[PDB]
Amino acid sequence: STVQTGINIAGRILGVLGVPFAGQIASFYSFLVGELWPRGRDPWEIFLEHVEQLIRQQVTENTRDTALARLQGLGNSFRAYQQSLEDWLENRDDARTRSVLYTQYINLELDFLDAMPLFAIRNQEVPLLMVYAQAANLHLLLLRDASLFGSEFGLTSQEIQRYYERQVEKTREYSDYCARWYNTGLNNLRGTNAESWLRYNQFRRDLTLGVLDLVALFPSYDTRVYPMNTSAQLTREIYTDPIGRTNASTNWFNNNAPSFSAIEAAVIRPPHLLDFPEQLTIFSVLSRWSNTQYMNYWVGHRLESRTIRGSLSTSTHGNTNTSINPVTLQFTSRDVYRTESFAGINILLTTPVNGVPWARFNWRNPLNSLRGSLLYTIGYTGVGTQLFDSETELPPETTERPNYESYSHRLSNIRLISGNTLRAPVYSWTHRSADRTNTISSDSITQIPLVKAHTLQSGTTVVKGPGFTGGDILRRTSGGPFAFSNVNLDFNLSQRYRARIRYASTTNLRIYVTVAGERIFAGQFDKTMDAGAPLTFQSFSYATINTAFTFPERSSSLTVGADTFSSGNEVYVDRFELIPVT
Amino acid sequence: STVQTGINIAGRILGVLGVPFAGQIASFYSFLVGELWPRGRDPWEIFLEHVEQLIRQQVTENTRDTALARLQGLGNSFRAYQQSLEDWLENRDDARTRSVLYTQYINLELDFLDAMPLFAIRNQEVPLLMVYAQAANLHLLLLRDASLFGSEFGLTSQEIQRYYERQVEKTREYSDYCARWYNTGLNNLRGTNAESWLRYNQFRRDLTLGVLDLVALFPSYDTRVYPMNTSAQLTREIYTDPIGRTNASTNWFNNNAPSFSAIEAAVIRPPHLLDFPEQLTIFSVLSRWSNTQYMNYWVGHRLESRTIRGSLSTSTHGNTNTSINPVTLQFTSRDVYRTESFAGINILLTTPVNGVPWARFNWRNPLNSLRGSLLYTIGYTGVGTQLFDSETELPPETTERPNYESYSHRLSNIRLISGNTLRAPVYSWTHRSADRTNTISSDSITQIPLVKAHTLQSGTTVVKGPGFTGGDILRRTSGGPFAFSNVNLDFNLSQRYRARIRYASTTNLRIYVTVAGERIFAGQFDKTMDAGAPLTFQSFSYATINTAFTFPERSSSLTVGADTFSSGNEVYVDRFELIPVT
Amino acid sequence: STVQTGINIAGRILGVLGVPFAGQIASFYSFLVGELWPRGRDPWEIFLEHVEQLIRQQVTENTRDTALARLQGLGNSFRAYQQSLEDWLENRDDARTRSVLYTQYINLELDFLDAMPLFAIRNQEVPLLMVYAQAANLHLLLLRDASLFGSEFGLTSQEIQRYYERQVEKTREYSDYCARWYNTGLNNLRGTNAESWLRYNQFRRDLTLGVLDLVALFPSYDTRVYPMNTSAQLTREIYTDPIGRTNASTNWFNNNAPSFSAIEAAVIRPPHLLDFPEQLTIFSVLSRWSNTQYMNYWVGHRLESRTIRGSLSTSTHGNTNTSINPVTLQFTSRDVYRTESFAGINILLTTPVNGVPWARFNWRNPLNSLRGSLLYTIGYTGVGTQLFDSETELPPETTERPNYESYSHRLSNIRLISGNTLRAPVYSWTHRSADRTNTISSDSITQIPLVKAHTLQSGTTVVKGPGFTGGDILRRTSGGPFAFSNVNLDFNLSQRYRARIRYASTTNLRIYVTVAGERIFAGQFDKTMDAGAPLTFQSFSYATINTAFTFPERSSSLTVGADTFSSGNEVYVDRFELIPVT
C-alpha cells in the first residue's frame, strides 16, 4: 500500500510535467488529496511505519505525534486550497476569489516552509524519508503554480520571481536531503549475511519507488527550463525479493550459502546501459526422496538482452547440464508485467533444498494489445510451496483498467542466487516510463537519459547515480563522444529540434551533438563544480546548443560528446533533451 | 474552576445561538478571550490537569508543552482577530480594515485547522478532551462568522459556501471525536468497588459540564438550519458526589457496602422522561453511644416527581419506619439551586456509621423572585462533620447578580446509597436551560427535546444519548406516535409555526405531528443510516413538514410520530423544533 | 561565536534605533538574516547548546527538535518577507506587491505570536533564554515596521494602532521574561566554592552580551517615544574570566583559597557610577626554585578611575612591597580594547603558585586614531604558561575594519583574586556604546543613563539593575536631587532641548532638571507602581518636562531630581533623555 501509493503518485506526475495546459492541475490536485488525505486511513503514518519496519528502528513516540499532526492540518489546508483552486476553474474576474485564493495559497506556501523541518528531525531523518519526500514534492508543485498562473492570481512579476527563486533553491535542497539520507539509511543496513541482505534490498526497492522516482521528476517542474509539455524517463533497475521460503526454521538464507558481500556483487548488475530481455532459457534439476516427494526446480538460466538497436548480449547463471530438458520462453518486445512464482522446499534427512518448480510470466505487447502467459514447470509433489506474486512488490498503479494495461514495471533481467543446495532467482525490473524506442514527440520536450544509449565510447564508464536523477550516469575523463543512442520520431518529420543536455563538469568545455554520425552542432559551456567536490544537485546544469536540426530518417541515431578540455578533469552526462522548435 | 468556566462558557453560548443580530458576537467574543485567555493563569492547563487527575493518568511532559504553546499563540491570534473584529463594529467602508481583518480571519481559521490534531494526540486523547472540545467550539464559532457576515468582509458567495461546508463536516467531526472519547474515557474507569465509582461518576459529571453541554450546541450554529435566533435545551441529569466522609481511615465506601455494579444500577436513573421534584419527605434514625455523642441521620426519603403536565410519580428509597418523626419539604415549581449538606460520622467500638443529620435546600421561584431555605435536621452532637456545598460541584455562572438569580442547575432527584450501617444521599440535577413549561417563543426557533414529553406510546423506549445531543433519546421500532408533549405560547397567539424534528432512521418514512390530538401535518423523509450502523452525528437529519399550523390554546399539546415503515427497522427522535413562520 | 554574534547583532541595532530614515531597515534586515540564518551552520542551536553547557543541563531531545524546526521555518518566512521588503524599496505604487508583502508581513507577525511560547517551555526556560531573547527582538522589530511604514503598506490607522498596542505589551512581556529567567538561571548556579564561581560568572557575562544588551534596546523601538533617531548607552560592567590555569590537577581554584561568597564580594564592584581607568601600577614578586625555573608574577595593582568630570579615585588590591620595581601603565582617555594575558604556574615540592608574569594592553584613542601596546613583564622561564586573549571572550563585532577600530568593549577596572600562593587578576569591561563625554547630538535623542553621572546626592544609592535597562539604577527615598552629570554639545549650540527622564516611583511627585546649577525646569508626574511591588518593566514611565532650554556652554552640567513627596516612598531614575526641539 505504501509502495502502491508511491507508484500511483509518481506515475501520475509523469503526465503533468513542465507546463500543463487547461485543467489537469486541478484533477491532479484532486487526485492528490484523495490519495494522500483519504477517508478512513492515514497514509502518512503508513509511510512512516513502513520505513520504520524496514530499518528496524521506530521513531520516538514524540516525533510521531508532531509530524502527523502537522501533516493533517496541512492537509486540511491543502484540501481547502485545492477546493477553491477547483473553483477558480470557472472564475475569470473577481476581486474576492483571487483574494481569498490569494491568501490561502500564500498561507499554505508559507505553511510548507515551516512544516518541512518538522519532517526532517535529527537522528530520525531516515524513518521520515518517505514522509519528507512526499511533502517536499507537494511544496514544489505549489511553487510551480506560482509561475504557471500566479501571474493571473493577482501576483506581480517580481513576486513570481521571488516565488520561482525558492522553487529553484528548494529543488536543490529537497533533492540533496533525500539523496544523502536515502544513502545513509541504505548504508546502515549494510550487513554481513544473507538475512541482512534481504532487509537491505527491501529498503532499496521500496524507498526507490516512493522517494527517488519522485525526486527525479523535481527538475521537470521548472517552468522556464520546460516551458511546454515535457516527457521524462526513469531508468533505474529495481530487484524484487529472491524467491525463497519464509515460514516454520531454515528458510532460504540459512540453507547454507552466501555472504552479504557475495550476494550483492552476484545479483546487482553493475551500472550498465538499459536493455530489455529477449529469450529466456531455464534449466532444471530433479531432487526427490521417493515417488511421492519430488520436484524439478530451477537451477540455471540463459537470458538474452538487447539495448535499443543493440547487438545481442547473453548472460549465463547457475547450472546448465541438460539431462532434463531445457525450456525456453520468448520475451522479445513483450512487457513481462506480472510474474507469479512458487518457492519450493524439499527436505532430506537434515539437508533441505530450495528451488523454483513453477514460474508464470504474464506479458503484454505495448504496441498492439496482445497478452499471454508463459509457463515454466516440469512436475512436483509432496514439497513445500510459497507463492511470489510480483504485484505484492510491484503493483500496477490504481486505475480503471486491468493490470495488463495499467502495469508500472517490466521484467528486465533475471539473476540467480546459487549455493550448495539452494537456488533463488531474483527478478530485476525497469520502470514503465523508460520506453523501448526512445520516441521523440513533435509537441513536447523529450528527455532521453544517456543510459538509454546502445554503445559507449572507448573511455566512457556508466557510474552509479547520485540518487536524484532517476538512474545511473555516464562519465568521461577526457574529450570525445560519450555514447551512441538511437531515436525515433512521429508522423510528421519536418520538425526542427534544438539539443540540450544535462551535464556536470569540472571545466569549461565544448559539448556537441552529431546526427546520423555526420552533421555536428556544438557549443561552449561552463564549469559546474569543483575538482574534489562530490556531485550534488547543483553540480548539474543544462547545456543548450543554439542551432536547430532536422532528423533525416524516422529511425536516426544521435551521439553526445564533449571535448576541448584537459584530461584528468571529470565530465558527467545524465540526459540529452530534444526541444521541438516551433 | 475548570467546571466553573465550562458553565460560564456553555451557558453564555445559549444566548447567542443561530443568527445573532447587532453586536452580541463581539461582546461574546470579548467575554470569550477573558474567560479563556485571562491574565494571571492558564485555564487550558487547568482543563488538562483536571481530567488528568480524574482518570489518574498524566499526559507526557511532551504533549503538555506542544498543545499549550499552540494554544496561547492561537490566543494571541484570537485576541488579535477579535480586537479588530471589535473595530469593524464601527466600520462600514474600508478597503484596508476589511483587508487586514480579512487576512487575520483567514489565517486563524486556517490556524485552527492545523491546531486541532495537536489537541488530539494518540494515546492521550482523553486527558485533552476538554482542551480539545473547547478549542473545537472556538473553530466552529468562527466558521459561523463566515456565513454570518463574511458576506460583507469581502468574501465571495462561493468561498462562504466553501467555509460553510467545512463547518458542516467539522461539526460532524468534532461531535464524533468528543462523544466516542468521552465514552472511551468513561469506559476505562469502570471499576469493581465503590471507591472507583466516585472517581467514575466524578469523571462523568465534570466532563459533561465542559464538553458534552458545549457539543450539544454545535448543531445550533448552522446559519441555514437556524437562520434566526434559536433556543436550546440541555436535558441530561448529572449527579453530584454522594454525601459521605473523606478524611483520617474508613470514609464512606470502606464502611462496608456495595459494589461498583451495585451502586451504578441503584442511583443512576435509567433513561426516563424529564421530571421536576415536588414533595420530599425525609425519614431519620437515631444512633448514639451516650448522652454526648448522638445524631439522627438520613435513612430514607420519598420524593414526588412530575413530568410537564404529567401524572404524579413517587419513588421510595431506604428505610421508612417512623418512630422518629418524618419531615416533609415542598419543592413544587421551586428551583432548588443550592444544597448545603453535612456528612456525619458516629463511631462505635469498631463499627462506624455514616449518615446525614443536616441538609438545607436553598430555593428560588423562577417566575416571580421568591427565595427560601428548607431545612432538615433533628439533633446531633459529638459526631464528625464534613460539609457538602453543591456550588463546589455545580457553581452558578460568573455574573453580576447573586446565586439565586444566576444559578445554572436545579435539584431534580435525590437517590440514596444504602448498606449495612451506611446512608449516602446523591443529588441528581438538571440544567437550567431545560425549562418547566416548554415555552414557545414568537420570534425564535424553539427546540423542545422529546425527552421533555410526558407520555410514551406503547412501544417507545427512551434510550441513552449518544453524547452529542444534550440528553437521552427516544426510539420506536415500528410505526406510530413517539411521545406526547405539552407546549405553551406567549402573549400574541395568532402565530403560525412549521414543525421540524431531528430524527435518525434506517428507512424512508412518514413523520407527522398532531396538534391538540386532532389535526395532523405529515411529510415523507429519507433514510439516514444503515441497519447495523452505530448512530453517529451524521445519522441525524432534520425533517421539515411543509405545512404551518396555529395553536388553539396557550396551553396546547403536541404529538410526534412516524409510521409507514416496516417494523424491525429503528427510528430515533431527539427533538422537535417549532419555526415561527412570518 | 555565540557571544560573537550577540555582539554583532546588539551593536548593529544601536545604529538603527527609534525612527530610521531611508533604507537602513532593509540592509539591517539583510544583515540580520545573514547572521541569524546563514549557510552552513545553525546559530540557534549554537545559542541553545551554549547556555546548556553553561548551566550544565541539556534540554530534552524533544524541546530541541520542536524549537529549531519552528525557528528555521520562521527563517524561511523571515527570509521571504525581507526579500520582498527588499523589493518594496523601489516600489511606489502597486496593488499587488503591497498585497503580497501585506500578507507575508501579517502572516509572519502572526507566526511570531505562536512561535514565542515554543521557545518558552516550562522547566527549560533558561537554556532557551538566548534563543528566546533573539526571537523576541525579531518580533519587536517587525511591529516597529508596522508603525514605521505600514501606514503605506495598505494598513489603516486603527490597525497600525492595534499593531502598536501589541508592540507595547510585547515589549513589557519580553522584557520581563528575560530579566526574571536570566535571574533564575543565574540563581541556580550560586555555588559554595571557586570552581562554581567561574561557571557562575561565565553564565553572567555570556548571557549579558546576547540577551540583556538586546533587551535594553527594546524601549528604543517605540515610534511615538522616539519619533526620530535616538542614541542609547549600555552601562553595565562585565567581568572576563580570572587569569589562571586550566589543564593537567590543581588549576587556579584548587590552589587553595577562597570561597564562592568570598570571591563574589571581592571582585564584583558594588553598584557604582561608571568610571574609566587612568593610571595602572603593577607590583610583582619573584618565586623561583632554581636558575632555570623562576617567574616574577603579578601580586598587586593600584588603579586610578575617574567618572565623567569626576575627582580621582584610586583603589588598591593585593600586595605592594617594592623590593622588585613597580611598573606603571597609562590608560587615561585610551580605550584598552584588547588584553593578551599569560597565566603562569610555578611548582614547589607539593605547593604550586599561580601568577601572571606577562600582560599586554592594546589601546586605541577613540578621538584621533592613536594606537599602542602597553607591556608588563619582568622575566620568567621554566614555568607553565596559558594564554588569555580578551577577544576569546569579548570579540570585536564582525566588520570590514581591524579590531582597534571595530572593538566593542574597553577595559574599565582590574580586580584581583588573592589567596595564599595565588594571584588571579580579573578584568572588568564596559561596553563601547557608553561614551566618555556624554555627547549630546543636535538631531537625535540622546539617552544619558544617570549611572553616567559624577556625584550622588546625600541620600541617593546606586542599586543593582533589574535586568532590562542596560545597567544599574539610582534610587532616592526622599525628595531632592538624584545625581550630578556633565554633558557636551556639538558644533552649533543655539539648540533648545526638552528633558525627559525614565523613572519609577511609588507616588505622584515633582521631577525637575537644573542646567548649570542655576535655572530649573520641573513638572508633576504620576505614580507608577505599588509600595511593596517588585519593579518590573511597566514600573518605568517617561516624565517629559514641558519647557525647552538652551545650554550655556559646550561643557555644561545637568542635575536630575525629584521632591514634593513623602519620604519612605521609593523613587527610581534610570536615564535622562534630551529631545532636541526643532
Cell readout for C490 is: 556639538
Measure the CA dihedral C95/C96/C100/C105, to 10°: -30
User: Which residues touch B249 (CB under 8 Å, ≥6 apart)?
Assistant: none
In SS3 terms, B376-440 reads as EECCEECCEEEEEEHHHHCCCCCCCCCHHHHCCEEEEEEEEEEECCEEEEEEEEEECCCCCCCEE
> CB of C77 within 8 Å of any CB in chain A?
yes
The CA distance from A153 to the nearest CA of chain B, in Å, is 15
Q: What is the DSSP string of A203-217?
A: HHHHHIIIIIHHHTT
Please give the residue of chain B at the shortest CA–CA distance from A91: B158
Which residue numbers come right before each break in chain B (C to N over 2.5 Å)? 248
Cβ contact B66–C66 (<8 Å): yes
The Cα–Cα gap between B494 and B513 comes to: 19
Vertex B114: Cα angle to C153 and B541 (nearest 5): 115
Where would I find the beta strands (DSSP E) of A450-495? 455-456, 461-463, 473-476, 480-489
The Cα–Cα gap between A217 and A14 comes to: 8
Measured in whole angstroms, how far is the alpha carbon of residue C229 from the centre of its chain? 20
The CA radius of gyration of chain A, in Å to the nearest whole number, is 25
Q: Do residues A471 and A235 make contact, with C-beta atoms less than 8 angstroms apart?
A: yes
Q: How many contacts (CB atoms, under 8 Å) link A and C?
A: 69
Residue B217, amino acid = L
Cell readout for A443 is: 509537441
In SS3 terms, C58-106 reads as CCCHHHHHHHHHHHHHHHHHHHHHHHHHHHHCCCCCCCCHHHHHHHHHH
Where would I find the beta strands (DSSP E) of A236-348? 237-239, 276-286, 294-306, 313-318, 327-330, 335-347
The CA distance from A83 to the nearest CA of chain B, in Å, is 8
Residue with cell 491568501: A103
Cell readout for C201 is: 560568572
The CA distance from A464 to the nearest CA of chain B, in Å, is 41
Residue closest to B213 by CA, chosen among B395, B450, B432: B432
Q: Do residues C411 and C361 make contact, with C-beta atoms less than 8 angstroms apart?
A: yes
Cell readout for B138 is: 472556538
**For A294-317, b where at least 16 C-beta lie within 10 A, e where not — what string?**
bbbbbbbbbbbbbbbbbeeeeeeb
Tell me the β-bridge partners of B303: B280, B315
Residue closest to C483 by CA, chosen among C271, C334, C332, C279: C271
Residue closest to C46 by CA, chosen among C106, C3, C12, C110: C3
Q: What is the DSSP string of B224-264?
A: TTS-SBEE-----EEEPPPS-------TTTSSS---HHHHH
The Cα–Cα gap between A166 and A169 comes to: 5
Which residues of chain C does A122 touch, with a Cβ-Cβ cutoff of 8 Å? 64-65
- For A157, B212, B482, the CA distances from B475, given in Å and listed in that order, are 64, 21, 8
The Cα–Cα gap between A448 and A451 comes to: 8
The CA radius of gyration of chain C, in Å to the nearest whole number, is 25
Residue closest to A412 by CA, chosen among A518, A494, A304: A304
Run of H or E including A196: helix A194-207
The Cα–Cα gap between B411 and C498 comes to: 69
Tell me the β-bridge partners of A503: A541, A573
Residue B457, amino acid = Q
Mutant choice from A76, A110, A111, A118 vs B, greatest count of B C-beta within 10 A: A76
> CB of B73 within 8 Å of any CB in chain C?
yes
The Cα–Cα gap between B236 and B216 comes to: 11
Q: Do residues B493 and B554 make contact, with C-beta atoms less than 8 angstroms apart?
A: yes
- Strand order in A335-347's β-sheet? A370-377, A352-365, A335-347, A384-389
User: Which residues touch A472 (CB under 8 Å, ≥6 apart)?
Assistant: A235, A236, A271, A272, A451, A462, A463, A464, A465
Residue closest to B464 by CA, chosen among B475, B473, B451: B473
Tell me the β-bridge partners of C446: C231, C578
Residue closest to A271 by CA, chosen among A452, A464, A475: A464
How are beta strands C445-449 and A571-581 bridged, if at all?
A: unpaired
End-to-end CA distance of chain B: 43
The Cα–Cα gap between C331 and B112 comes to: 62
Residue closest to C65 by CA, chosen among B66, A390, B415: B66
Mutant choice from C37, C68, C92, C100 vs A, greatest count of A C-beta within 10 A: C100
Between helix B129-153 and helix B24-36 the angle, nearest 10°, is 150
Q: Do residues A350 and A421 make contact, with C-beta atoms less than 8 angstroms apart?
A: no
Q: Do residues A429 and A440 make contact, with C-beta atoms less than 8 angstroms apart?
A: no
Question: Which CATH number fits the domain C225-236+437-582, given the four candidates 2.60.120.260, 3.40.50.300, 3.40.630.10, 3.30.70.1450?
Answer: 2.60.120.260
Which residues of chain A does C68 touch, with a Cβ-Cβ cutoff of 8 Å? 117
Handedness of CA A446, A447, A452, A457 (dihedral sign): positive
In SS3 terms, C266-290 reads as HHCCCCCCCCEEEEEEEEEEECCCC
Measure the CA dihedral B247/B252/B254/B255, to 10°: 120
Q: What is the DSSP string of C322-334?
A: -SS--EEEE-TT-
Residue with cell 520581563: C176
Please give the residue of chain A at the shortest CA–CA distance from C74: A114
Q: How was this structure determined?
A: X-ray
Cβ contact B115–A74 (<8 Å): no
The Cα–Cα gap between B140 and B157 comes to: 19
Q: Do residues C240 and C426 make contact, with C-beta atoms less than 8 angstroms apart?
A: yes
Residue with cell 619582568: C378
Let me know how many helices (H) and strands (E) chain C has, helices first: 12, 26
Long-range contacts of C247-253 (CB under 8 A, 24+ apart): C247/C386, C250/C352, C252/C343, C252/C354, C252/C422, C252/C424, C253/C193, C253/C194, C253/C195, C253/C197, C253/C198
Measured in whole angstroms, how far is the alpha carbon of residue C547 from the centre of its chain? 32
Residue C242's Cβ-count burial label (10 Å; 0-12, 13-18, 19+) is buried
Cβ contact A77–B106 (<8 Å): no
What residues does each domain of chain B span?
1-224, 225-236+437-582, 237-436
Cβ contact A96–B63 (<8 Å): no
Which residues of chain B does C110 touch, with a Cβ-Cβ cutoff of 8 Å? 77, 80, 104, 107-108, 111
Per DSSP, C526 falls in state -
Which residues of chain A does B95 touch, with a Cβ-Cβ cutoff of 8 Å? none
Cell readout for B549 is: 399550523
Cβ contact B99–C66 (<8 Å): no
Cβ contact B159–A97 (<8 Å): yes
Chain C stretch 105-134, residues whose beta carbon is closer than 8 A to a beta carbon of chain B: 106-107, 110, 113-118, 120-123
How are beta strands A276-286 and A461-463 bridged, if at all?
A: unpaired
- Of the candidates A66, A117, A154, which has its C-beta nearest C72's C-beta? A117
Measured in whole angstroms, how far is the alpha carbon of residue C50 from the centre of its chain? 19
- For A16, A89, A154, A222, B353, the CA distances from A105, given in Å and listed in that order, are 20, 15, 11, 19, 70
Residue closest to A344 by CA, chosen among A353, A334, A335, A332: A353
Q: Do residues B10 and B209 make contact, with C-beta atoms less than 8 angstroms apart?
A: yes
Which residues of chain A does B113 touch, with a Cβ-Cβ cutoff of 8 Å? 73, 76-77, 80
Residue closest to A573 by CA, chosen among A409, A410, A434, A459: A459
Count of residues for chain C? 582
Cell readout for C439 is: 555627547
Q: What are phi and psi of C557, to 5 degrees?
A: -130, 145
Dmax (CA) of chain B: 85
Residue closest to A550 by CA, chosen among A501, A500, A503, A492: A492
Handedness of CA A462, A464, A468, A470 (dihedral sign): positive
Which residues of chain A does C73 touch, with a Cβ-Cβ cutoff of 8 Å? 113-118
The Cα–Cα gap between C354 and C252 comes to: 6
Q: Do residues A103 and C103 make contact, with C-beta atoms less than 8 angstroms apart?
A: yes
The CA distance from B156 to the nearest CA of chain A, in Å, is 6
Q: Do residues B509 and B571 make contact, with C-beta atoms less than 8 angstroms apart?
A: yes
Residue C360, amino acid = R
Per the rule left: phi > 0, alpha: psi between -120 and 50, beta: everything else, B128 is alpha
In SS3 terms, B452-477 reads as HCCEECCCCEEECCCCCCCCCEEEEC
Q: Do residues A60 and A48 make contact, with C-beta atoms less than 8 angstroms apart?
A: no
Which residues of chain B does C60 touch, with a Cβ-Cβ cutoff of 8 Å? 61-62
Cβ contact B120–A69 (<8 Å): yes
Which residues of chain C does A60 touch, with a Cβ-Cβ cutoff of 8 Å? 61-62
Measured in whole angstroms, how far is the alpha carbon of residue C444 from the centre of its chain? 21
Where would I find the beta strands (DSSP E) of C533-570? 541-544, 549-550, 555-563
User: Which residues touch B70 (CB under 8 Å, ≥6 apart)?
Assistant: B115, B118, B119, C114
The Cα–Cα gap between A304 and A328 comes to: 11
Please give the residue of chain C at the shortest CA–CA distance from A170: C76
Q: Do residues A196 and A260 make contact, with C-beta atoms less than 8 angstroms apart?
A: yes
CATH architecture for segment(s) C237-436: Aligned Prism (2.100)
- Of the candidates C114, C117, C156, which has its C-beta nearest B96's C-beta? C156
Which residues of chain A does C104 touch, with a Cβ-Cβ cutoff of 8 Å? 106, 110
Q: Do residues C325 and C283 make contact, with C-beta atoms less than 8 angstroms apart?
A: no
Residue B469's Cβ-count burial label (10 Å; 0-12, 13-18, 19+) is buried
Which residues of chain B does A96 touch, with a Cβ-Cβ cutoff of 8 Å? 154-156, 159
Cell readout for C344 is: 603562569
Mutant choice from C62, C109, C114 vs B, greatest count of B C-beta within 10 A: C114
Residue closest to C393 by CA, chosen among C255, C198, C215: C198
Residue C438, amino acid = N
H-type alpha helices, A59-128: 61-88, 97-118
Of the CA atoms within 13 Å of residue B91, those in its CB half-sphere come to: 21
H-type alpha helices, C333-399: 390-393
Cell readout for B563 is: 409510521
User: Could you give the 3-state DSSP secondary structure of residue B41?
Assistant: coil
Cβ contact B72–C117 (<8 Å): yes
What resolution in Å is listed for this PDB structure? 2.7
The CA distance from A48 to the nearest CA of chain C, in Å, is 18
Residue with cell 412570518: B582
User: Which residues touch B325 (CB under 8 Å, ≥6 apart)?
Assistant: B284, B378
Which residues of chain B does A74 touch, with a Cβ-Cβ cutoff of 8 Å? 114
The Cα–Cα gap between B137 and C53 comes to: 44
Residue with cell 542609547: C232
Of the CA atoms within 13 Å of residue C489, those in its CB half-sphere come to: 21
Cβ count near B552 (within 10 Å)? 12
Run of H or E including C26: helix C24-36
The Cα–Cα gap between C481 and B277 comes to: 75
The Cα–Cα gap between B237 and B208 comes to: 10
Residue closest to C161 by CA, chosen among C223, C252, C230: C223
Residue with cell 528575560: C178
Please give the residue of chain B at the shortest CA–CA distance from A73: B114
Per DSSP, B94 falls in state -
Chain B stretch 80-99, residues whose beta carbon is closer than 8 A to a beta carbon of chain C: 80, 83-84, 87, 94, 96-97, 99
**For B225-247, b where at least 16 C-beta lie within 10 A, e where not — what string?**
bbebbbbbbbbbbbbbbbbbbee
> CB of B264 within 8 Å of any CB in chain C?
no
Which residues of chain B does A111 touch, with a Cβ-Cβ cutoff of 8 Å? 110, 114
Residue with cell 575538482: A531
Cβ contact B117–A87 (<8 Å): no
The CA distance from A185 to the nearest CA of chain B, in Å, is 27
- Of the candidates C114, C120, C166, which has its C-beta nearest B74's C-beta? C114
Cell readout for C331 is: 590608560
- Of the candidates C65, C76, C94, which has its C-beta nearest A113's C-beta? C76
Residue closest to C240 by CA, chosen among C422, C397, C394: C394
CATH fold of C1-224:
Delta-Endotoxin; domain 1 (1.20.190)
The Cα–Cα gap between C31 and B242 comes to: 67
Cβ contact C96–A154 (<8 Å): yes
Measured in whole angstroms, how far is the alpha carbon of residue C468 from the centre of its chain? 10
The Cα–Cα gap between C21 and A424 comes to: 77
Per DSSP, B96 falls in state T
Vertex A103: Cα angle to A97 and A106 (nearest 5): 130
Run of H or E including C48: helix C43-55
Cβ contact B96–C122 (<8 Å): no
Q: What is the DSSP string of A237-249?
A: EEEPPPS------
Cβ contact A80–B107 (<8 Å): no
Q: Do residues A23 and A89 make contact, with C-beta atoms less than 8 angstroms apart?
A: yes
The Cα–Cα gap between A124 and A165 comes to: 29
- Interface partners of chain C (CB pairs < 8 Å, 3 or more) are A, B
Tell me the β-bridge partners of C303: C280, C315
The Cα–Cα gap between C59 and B70 comes to: 20
Run of H or E including B353: strand B352-365
Residue C221's Cβ-count burial label (10 Å; 0-12, 13-18, 19+) is buried
The Cα–Cα gap between A98 and A85 comes to: 10
Per the rule left: phi > 0, alpha: psi between -120 and 50, beta: everything else, B126 is alpha
The Cα–Cα gap between A372 and A334 comes to: 9
Cβ contact C114–B83 (<8 Å): no
Cell readout for B196 is: 472507583
How are beta strands A480-489 and A439-440 bridged, if at all?
A: parallel
